[PDB]
Each structure stands twice: as C-alpha cells, then as structure tokens.
Amino acid sequence: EGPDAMYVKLISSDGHEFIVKREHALTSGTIKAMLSGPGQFAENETNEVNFREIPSHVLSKVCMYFTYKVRYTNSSTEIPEFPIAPEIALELLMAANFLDC
Amino acid sequence: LPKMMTLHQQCIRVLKNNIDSIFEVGGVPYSVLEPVLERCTPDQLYRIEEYNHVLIEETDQLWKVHCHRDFKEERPEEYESWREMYLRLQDAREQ
Amino acid sequence: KDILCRLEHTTLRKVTANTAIYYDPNPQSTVVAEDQEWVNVYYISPWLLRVELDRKHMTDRKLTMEQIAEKINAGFGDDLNCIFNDDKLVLRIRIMNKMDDDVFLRCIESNMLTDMTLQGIEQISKVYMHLPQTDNKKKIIITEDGEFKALQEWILETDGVSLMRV
Amino acid sequence: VGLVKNLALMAYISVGSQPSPILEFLEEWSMENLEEISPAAIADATKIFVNGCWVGIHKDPEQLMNTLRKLRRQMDIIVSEVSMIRDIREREIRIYTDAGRICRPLLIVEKQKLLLKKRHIDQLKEREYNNYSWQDLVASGVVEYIDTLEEETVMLAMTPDDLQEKEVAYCSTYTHCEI
Amino acid sequence: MDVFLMIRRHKTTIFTDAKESSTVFELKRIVEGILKRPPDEQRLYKDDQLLDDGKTLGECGFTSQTARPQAPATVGLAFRADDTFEAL
Amino acid sequence: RSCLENSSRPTSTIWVSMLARGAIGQRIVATLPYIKQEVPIIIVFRALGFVSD
Amino acid sequence: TVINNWLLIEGHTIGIGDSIADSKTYQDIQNTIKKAKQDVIEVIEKAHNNELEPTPGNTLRQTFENQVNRILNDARDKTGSSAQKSLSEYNNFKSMVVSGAKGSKINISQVIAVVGQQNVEGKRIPFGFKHRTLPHFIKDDYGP
Amino acid sequence: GFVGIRFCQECNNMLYPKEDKENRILLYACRNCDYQQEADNSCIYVNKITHEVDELTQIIADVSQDPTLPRTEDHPCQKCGHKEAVFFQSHSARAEDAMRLYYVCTAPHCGHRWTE
Ligand SMILES: [Zn+2]
Numbered sequence: 020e021g022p023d024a025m026y027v028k029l030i031s032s033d034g035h036e037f038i039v040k041r042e043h044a045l046t047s048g049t050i051k052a053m054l055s056g057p058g059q060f061a062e063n064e065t066n067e068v069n070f071r072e073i074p075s076h077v078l079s080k081v082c083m084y085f086t087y088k089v090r091y092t093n094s095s096t097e098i099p100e101f102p103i104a105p106e107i108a109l110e111l112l113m114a115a116n117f118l119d120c
Numbered sequence: 121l122p123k124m125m126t127l128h129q130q131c132i133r134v135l136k137n138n139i140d141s142i143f144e145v146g147g148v149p150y151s152v153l154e155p156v157l158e159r160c161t162p163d164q165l166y167r168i169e170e171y172n173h174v175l176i177e178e179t180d181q182l183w184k185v186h187c188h189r190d191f192k193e194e195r196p197e198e199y200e201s202w203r204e205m206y207l208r209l210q211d212a213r214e215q
Numbered sequence: 216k217d218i219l220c221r222l223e224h225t226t227l228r229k230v231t232a233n234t235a236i237y238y239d240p241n242p243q244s245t246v247v248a249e250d251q252e253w254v255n256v257y258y259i260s261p262w263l264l265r266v267e268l269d270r271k272h273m274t275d276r277k278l279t280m281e282q283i284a285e286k287i288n289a290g291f292g293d294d295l296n297c298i299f300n301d302d303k304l305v306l307r308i309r310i311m312n313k314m315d316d317d318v319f320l321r322c323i324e325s326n327m328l329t330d331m332t333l334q335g336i337e338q339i340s341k342v343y344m345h346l347p348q349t350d351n352k353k354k355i356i357i358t359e360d361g362e363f364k365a366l367q368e369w370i371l372e373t374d375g376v377s378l379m380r381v
Numbered sequence: 382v383g384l385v386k387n388l389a390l391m392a393y394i395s396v397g398s399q400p401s402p403i404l405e406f407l408e409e410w411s412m413e414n415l416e417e418i419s420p421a422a423i424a425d426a427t428k429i430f431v432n433g434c435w436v437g438i439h440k441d442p443e444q445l446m447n448t449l450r451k452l453r454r455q456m457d458i459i460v461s462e463v464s465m466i467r468d469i470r471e472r473e474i475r476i477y478t479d480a481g482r483i484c485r486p487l488l489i490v491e492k493q494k495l496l497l498k499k500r501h502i503d504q505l506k507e508r509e510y511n512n513y514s515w516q517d518l519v520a521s522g523v524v525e526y527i528d529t530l531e532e533e534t535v536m537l538a539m540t541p542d543d544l545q546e547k548e549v550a551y552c553s554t555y556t557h558c559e560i
Numbered sequence: 561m562d563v564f565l566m567i568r569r570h571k572t573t574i575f576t577d578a579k580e581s582s583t584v585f586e587l588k589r590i591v592e593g594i595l596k597r598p599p600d601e602q603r604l605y606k607d608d609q610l611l612d613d614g615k616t617l618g619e620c621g622f623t624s625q626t627a628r629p630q631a632p633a634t635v636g637l638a639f640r641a642d643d644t645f646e647a648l
Numbered sequence: 649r650s651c652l653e654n655s656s657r658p659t660s661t662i663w664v665s666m667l668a669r670g671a672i673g674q675r676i677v678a679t680l681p682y683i684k685q686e687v688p689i690i691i692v693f694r695a696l697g698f699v700s701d
Numbered sequence: 702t703v704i705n706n707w708l709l710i711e712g713h714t715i716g717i718g719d720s721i722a723d724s725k726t727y728q729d730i731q732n733t734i735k736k737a738k739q740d741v742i743e744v745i746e747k748a749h750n751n752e753l754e755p756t757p758g759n760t761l762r763q764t765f766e767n768q769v770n771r772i773l774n775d776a777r778d779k780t781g782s783s784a785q786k787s788l789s790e791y792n793n794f795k796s797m798v799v800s801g802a803k804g805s806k807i808n809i810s811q812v813i814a815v816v817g818q819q820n821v822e823g824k825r826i827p828f829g830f831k832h833r834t835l836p837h838f839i840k841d842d843y844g845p
Numbered sequence: 846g847f848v849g850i851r852f853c854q855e856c857n858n859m860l861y862p863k864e865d866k867e868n869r870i871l872l873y874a875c876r877n878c879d880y881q882q883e884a885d886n887s888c889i890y891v892n893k894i895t896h897e898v899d900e901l902t903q904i905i906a907d908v909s910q911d912p913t914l915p916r917t918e919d920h921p922c923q924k925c926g927h928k929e930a931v932f933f934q935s936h937s938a939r940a941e942d943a944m945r946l947y948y949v950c951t952a953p954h955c956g957h958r959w960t961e
C-alpha cells in the first residue's frame with residue numbers, strides 16, 4: 020500500500036481486502052496491464068487495486084496461490100499442486116478470468 | 121504429479137476430476153468452461169444444461185463430439201441442433 | 216569370431232532381405248530400372264530372379280557377393296547365369312536353355328533359400344562364443360617355474376553335432 | 382496332482398440356455414445376417430458368434446456390447462449366466478449360452494465407483510425382513526457373473542481401494558471388482 | 561525455509577515472507593515499514609500454542625508445517641497492546 | 649469339435665490343417681468326419697456349391 | 702542320549718519372535734525392494750523406447766528377462782542378507798540353520814524379508830490370459 | 846512391392862502368369878476358360894523375408910476402447926492433439942525380437958496410431 024512497492028493492496032468489493040508482495044504477485048497477467056498501465060513509474064505505487072465481485076476467501080486463495088506460484092516457479096521445486104476446495108473453484112474460475120493466468 | 125500448473129489449469133483439472141460436483145455455474149462463460157465440458161458424458165451435460173440453461177446455445181457443438189461417438193452412422197437434418205437430435209435419437213433408441 | 220563364422224551354418228536365407236521374380240525379356244532395358252547401369256555394363260530366359268541381401272547380415276558374416284556368386288556357379292555348374300552388383304546388394308539370376316520356366320525358377324529359388332550353404336558346417340545351427348571365468352573349461356598349463364596356471368581362452372559351443380568336420 | 386481339481390467357493394458352473402431370445406434380439410438390433418450380406422462388408426464389421434455359430438456382422442460393436450451388458454445386468458432378454466466377449470482386436474463378439482461354463486460373481490464398477498452402495502448393504506442386513514436377497518442384488522445391476530472367457534476382457538480391481546486411488550491408480554478403467 | 565501466516569485483522573490481512581527463525585517483533589517491524597504501524601499497534605496474538613515472549617520464530621506455535629505454501633495458518637490481530645482489542 | 653445345440657448328440661470334429669514347409673508351397677487340407685483321407689479345402693468349398701475361386 | 706538329556710535343561714523352540722526383524726531392517730528391506738522395482742521400471746522404459754541393447758547369443762525379450770531376473774535376484778539376495786544380518790544369537794531359525802539341522806538361509810530370507818520371484822518352467826509367471834498374468838493387471842505388464 | 850491375385854471375368858477364377866513370345870511380353874491368362882489379359886506389373890512373385898519391420902497397418906483403432914490396455918497422458922496425439930492414448934506391445938510372432946510400444950489415440954473420430 021506504501022509507495023515503496025513491495026506491498027500492494029488489492030480489494031474485491033469485500034471488507035477483507037488483501038495486501039501482498041508485488042514480487043510474489045509478479046506472475047499476474049494483468050499486473051502488466053493495469054498496474055503497468057499506459058505509463059509505468061508511480062502508476063504501480065498507488066496500490067489501490069479495486070476489483071469487484073470476488074468473495075474474500077476466494078481471492079485469499081488466489082493471492083496465496085500468487086505467492087505459491089512465484090516461489091514454486093523457477094525454484095528448485097516444480098512438482099507441487101494447489102489444493103482448492105471443489106465448490107469455490109467455480110467462483111475461483113471467475114478469478115481465472117481476471118488475472119490472465 | 122511432476123507438473124507445474126497455472127490457475128486455469130489447476131481449476132480445470134480439479135473440476136475435470138469432479139464434474140459431478142457442479143450444480144450451478146453462476147456466470148462463467150463457456151469459453152472458460154470449454155475444457156471441463158469436453159471431458160464429460162452426455163447425462164452430465166443434460167444435468168448441467170438443465171440447471172444452467174443459459175449455456176445451452178453455446179454447448180451444441182460439444183454435443184457433436186458425443187453424437188459421432190454414440191450415433192456415428194448419423195448426420196443431423198436441417199433445423200436440428202445436435203442437442204435435440206441426441207435427445208431424440210437417445211429416447212427413440214431407449215423406446 | 217572368424218572361426219565362429221567359419222563354423223556356423225549360413226544359408227542364403229540368413230542374409231537375404233528379399234527375392235522377387237520378374238518378367239525381363241530384354242536385359243538391355245531392365246524393368247526394375249534400378250539395375251539398368253550394371254546390367255548394361257555386363258551386356259537368356261525372360262524370367263529374372265532378383266535377390267536383395269540385407270546389409271547387416273552380409274557384413275557380420277563377412278560375406279562378399281563374389282563368394283555367393285561362385286557358390287551359385289559351383290552349386291549348379293552353369294545351368295543358370297547369375298550377375299550381381301552393389302555400390303542394395305543385388306543379384307540377378309536367369310536360367311539359360313511342360314513345366315514352364317517360372318515354376319522351375321520357383322523351385323531353384325526354394326533351393327536357394329533352403330538347400331544352399333554359404334559358409335560353415337551344415338549340422339551346426341548356432342555357435343556361442345564365450346570366455347570362461349571358471350577352471351572347468353580353461354587351458355591349464357605348466358609354466359617354466361612349474362605351477363598350474365589357468366589361461367582364459369575363448370571357447371565355442373554348438374547347437375548341433377558335426378564333430379569330425381569341426 | 383493337478384488333474385483332480387476343486388471348485389472355488391463362489392464359482393458357479395453355467396447350466397445352459399436357449400440362444401433364441403439373444404438371436405431374435407440381435408436380428409432386430411441392426412445385425413445383418415450372413416445370408417443377406419456381400420462379403421465386402423465383412424472386412425470392416427464385427428463378426429457375431431452365438432454359441433460359436435457365426436450368425437451375422439455388426440457395424441457398431443461398442444454400443445451393441447453396451448446394450449447387451451445393460452440387458453444382462455437388469456435380467457432382461459439375456460439371462461445372467463450368458464457370457465458375452467468382445468475380442469476388440471480381432472473384431473469379434475462371441476455370445477455363449479451353453480452349459481459347462483464356470484463363472485463367478487463380480488461387483489460392477491462404473492467410472493471408478495462401485496455400483497454397490499450403502500442402500501444395498503442396508504437392505505441385505507435384513508435379508509429375512511425385506512425379502513431382499515442375492516438375486517435382487519443381481520437384478521439391481523450391481524453384481525454379475527463373469528466366466529473365464531469374459532474375465533480375459535474385464536479389468537478387475539482387487540479391492541475398492543484400487544478404485545479410490547489417487548493420480549496414478551495404475552488403471553483408470555476398472556470394469557469389475559472382486560467381492 | 562519459508563513462513564506462511566495470514567496476518568489477519570478483521571478486514572485487513574497482511575502477507576509476510578521470512579524463514580524458520582526470526583524475532584517475532586521483526587514481524588512488527590516489517591509491518592511498520594510499509595503500513596506505518598507502531599509497536600503498540602502490533603499486538604500479535606497467540607498461535608494455537610501460546611505466543612513467543614522469547615521473541616523468535618522457532619519457538620512455540622510455529623513448526624515446519626506452518627510454513628505451508630499450500631495453505632497457511634491464520635490468527636486474529638489487535639492493533640493495541642493494552643487498551644482495547646478491536647475485532648471488526 | 650462341432651456339436652449341435654438344443655440336442656444331445658456326439659460332437660463331430662473337423663480339422664482344417666496346413667501342411668508343413670518340408671513341397672512347392674504349404675497347402676490347407678481338411679480332415680472331415682467319416683472321411684478316411686485328408687481333402688484339400690478348395691475341393692470342400694467347391695462341393696459346398698461355390699466353384700469360382 | 703547325552704545331548705537329548707542336556708536339551709531338557711537348555712531347551713529349544715521356534716516362535717513368531719524368530720520371524721521378526723528390527724524396524725531398521727524392515728526399512729532396509731523396503732528400501733531395497735523399492736529401489737529394485739524402480740530399476741525394473743527403468744529397464745522396462747529402456748526396452749519400451751527401443752534403447753535396450755541385446756546381448757550376444759540372445760534375443761531382445763530374453764535379454765530383458767535376464768536383466769529383470771538379475772535385478773530381482775539381487776533384490777532377493779540383498780534383502781536376505783539384511784535378514785540374516787538382523788538375526789541375533791538367540792534366534793532359533795539361525796540356530797537351526799547354523800547347526801545344519803533344518804532350514805537354510807533362503808528359508809530365513811523368505812520368512813523374514815522377501816519370498817521372491819515365482820517361476821513356472823524356469824521363466825516368470827506366464828501370460829495365461831491375453832498378455833496378462835491375471836485380470837487385475839493391465840496388458841503387457843512386465844513389472845515385478 | 847507385393848503382388849495380389851488378379852481374377853478372370855468369364856468364370857471369376859484365378860489368372861496365372863504366362864508369356865507371349867510373339868509380342869514377347871507378360872500376360873495373366875485364365876486356364877479354366879480361354880480368357881487372357883495383358884499383365885500390368887512385371888513382378889510375378891516376391892519374398893518379404895525381412896520386410897516385417899512394420900506393424901502399424903495391422904493395428905485397428907477399436908483398441909482405444911479396450912479397458913485392459915494401459916493408458917497414458919504423456920504421449921499426445923500428433924494428428925489431433927488429444928492428451929490421452931493407449932499403448933501396447935506388438936501382438937505378432939514377429940514381436941519376439943522387439944518390446945516396441947505402439948500408441949493409439951483414445952479420442953473418437955481420430956484413431957491415429959503411431960510409434961514412440
Ligand atoms: Zn476364366
């Protein structure tokens with residue numbers, strides 16, 4: 020949330036917003052197109068990412084997956100999977116719309 | 121599983137194991153839902169389409185993959201989408 | 216290995232890839248047309264027996280096509296003429312001079328495949344070379360110092376018995 | 382030794398049946414007779430043998446075997462002891478109704494799940510109250526008798542633990558389970 | 561190795577990354593760096609086991625399992641040490 | 649070992665065999681019940697009522 | 702007479718505790734079995750991807766069988782060696798084996814560690830079904 | 846290449862090879878009736894002694910429905926991109942010298958068969 024960008028805040032129209040490592044949110048497709056928008060260099064540092072219509076636990080799983088995938092891609096480990104609950108996958112699949120991954 | 125998966129692949133492999141868990145899709149477009157519905161069987165497609173009617177006109181080409189697997193000797197006639205042909209021949213064969 | 220090749224029976228069947236029968240009444244214009252150049256170099260019944268031999272079997276048996284050709288000539292005594300070349304290992308056999316010659320060439324091709332020996336001894340089907348690691352089948356010698364010394368030397372086994380020829 | 386054998390406990394030797402219902406059903410389930418076909422149609426079709434009698438050919442053998450298994454599992458036209466074998470590689474369907482075929486009952490597995498549910502077990506716990514018996518379990522399409530020729534085409538799970546198995550189950554196409 | 565705790569204050573959750581041994585108020589320092597939180601505003605609660613007054617991460621409540629990228633371990637937060645403990 | 653169904657009769661056995669290589673080619677013969685010698689199979693097909701090859 | 706009357710004082714038994722090994726020994730046996738099964742799978746993958754070189758005097762299937770039987774015999778030998786190495790001086794299987802009275806080290810190995818490969822007519826268990834030993838396996842399964 | 850049976854038309858019997866020296870060419874003649882026909886291919890008979898290297902043409906696609914066959918998802922189909930395929934060794938008597946795997950795509954309407 021602070022303009023020194025290693026913590027970025029992101030909101031889903033829910034009370035439970037989430038603030039995450041930008042370096043561990045680096046694998047987002049849309050971090051290159053709505054924080055790295057028409058011009059870089061302090062467009063990113065605003066850290067008001069006001070997404071809509073996502074329940075809190077869903078994007079908690081999504082951004083925990085962000086940290087998960089960033090530190091489990093190009094590391095010494097490549098095997099592990101992601102244990103999502105079966106029902107929430109549906110609404111998590113709409114998160115699959117947003118983040119281009 | 122010595123494989124890396126992104127969010128699309130993770131969600132669709134979990135859902136590709138438990139198609140049966142789907143009751144109502146909410147508002148997902150078919151273009152997103154295209155993988156899990158192609159690895160599926162026609163009774164489950166009937167269940168999905170009769171809980172999630174808005175998908176019907178999207179899934180008809182999918183029914184072709186079923187039709188040429190269950191009625192491989194057949195072709196549609198004109199004014200016959202593949203879903204209604206599959207249901208008509210399926211009920212005719214059961215009768 | 217040279218002795219093993221000289222002992223193991225080698226028919227033409229062990230080294231032949233294929234045999235085909237053709238109607239070629241004019242060797243000046245070969246119908247197969249892949250053998251035109253060397254047949255025209257050489258240049259008769261209109262029936263042709265074209266024998267193609269595998270590369271690997273003709274190599275590891277250490278056989279050259281001249282040996283097969285002279286084996287043909289010794290087997291039949293110029294009852295039939297066999298030309299050959301390679302640079303595909305190609306033989307071409309005709310029968311010079313009421314049992315039409317196609318079934319006679321049938322029969323001599325059966326004789327080719329079964330009843331002809333290239334190298335080795337007829338009753339011996341397979342020869343297994345080995346170097347024994349035990350003293351049961353070694354060459355024990357008495358040295359100049361006077362000990363019994365076991366010498367590991369290559370020994371052969373057979374699957375048939377032709378002891379006197381061996 | 383080896384020449385005198387004994388039955389396994391659930392082994393049942395088939396008693397014999399008339400091929401006539403299966404033959405009639407095959408005649409009007411799109412199988413064409415041998416008398417009415419040109420030989421050119423035999424190369425791509427599936428030969429159908431009923432008690433070793435080549436009676437015709439079929440163009441869609443997979444749905445035919447699905448239909449025949451559905452008929453036998455609900456104790457329709459095909460009785461339970463009839464053996465039906467699809468030699469898939471050799472394009473043949475052999476139906477045996479004769480006596481002397483030794484078979485055994487196996488639980489039917491569809492999509493890595495037993496068709497035997499807790500409702501069947503609960504009904505069988507009160508066998509002398511519900512009048513639910515083993516024959517009702519056969520008629521339910523839960524168990525079926527597989528002989529030695531059909532067993533050579535089935536895929537047996539040794540236990541239901543082979544069904545409820547994770548990403549590498551060693552087989553995802555189990556058709557039957559040992560009781 | 562890693563660490564994974566959802567620093568959960570009802571409607572605000574902080575993310576962290578650290579290793580199996582670090583003083584537990586350095587967590588408050590790394591919250592302070594970007595979220596401008598004085599140590600009064602950083603009364604971290606217990607884990608399922610009681611919290612670490614000895615002030616390291618390799619002490620009670622934290623194991624090698626709680627550094628799970630598959631799913632972390634969460635607990636509530638109160639941004640006041642003695643006065644009030646505000647939830648929602 | 650052919651035996652007619654729906655009846656209790658002895659089984660009649662037919663042997664459609666092929667001769668060994670050791671003969672210009674190897675031929676298919678038929679050992680029929682109540683026939684002393686082996687019969688070539690094309691003769692059996694012609695006697696069944698199909699003369700053309 | 703003298704030894705049979707001293708055996709009244711000493712006594713000799715066999716029990717289920719003579720069939721038990723150490724937990725470390727069980728771990729070693731399971732590790733050896735796992736490694737040998739992995740080796741058999743690797744030889745299977747080499748033969749399946751046409752990377753298996755035939756040995757002189759034998760065809761490809763018989764060289765594969767020789768390699769697999771060598772791996773499994775090494776497994777049975779190593780697990781048996783660990784089984785005898787686990788045995789105490791009070792072990793009665795070991796007592797009857799080193800006395801020469803009854804049994805062998807193979808019997809101790811089969812009781813404690815690994816029964817081993819079953820052979821019919823000198824080869825492994827044949828494909829009595831269509832390319833399957835039993836209908837509980839998949840077709841063309843050449844694993845242990 | 847192989848040579849097949851060429852049939853007569855008058856009696857539908859077998860045509861046997863023969864030569865005419867007046868035209869000095871090759872003809873397939875029927876010797877039940879008096880039919881004759883000029884022969885297209887000069888090859889009368891061919892051995893295929895070591896031409897058993899191919900087994901793909903004898904495989905049929907129906908083995909994709911075999912539940913006892915091993916299935917893999919690490920060998921995608923080249924013709925259609927389906928992820929799943931059955932694999933099996935050759936079932937011939939020529940398979941004593943090879944444990945080579947053949948693969949058949951399990952997607953319907955494709956039936957593509959390949960090797961390794
Ligand atoms: Zn004619």
Ligand SMILES: [Zn+2]
Pocket residue numbers: 922923924925926927950951952955956957
């Ligand atoms: Zn395909």
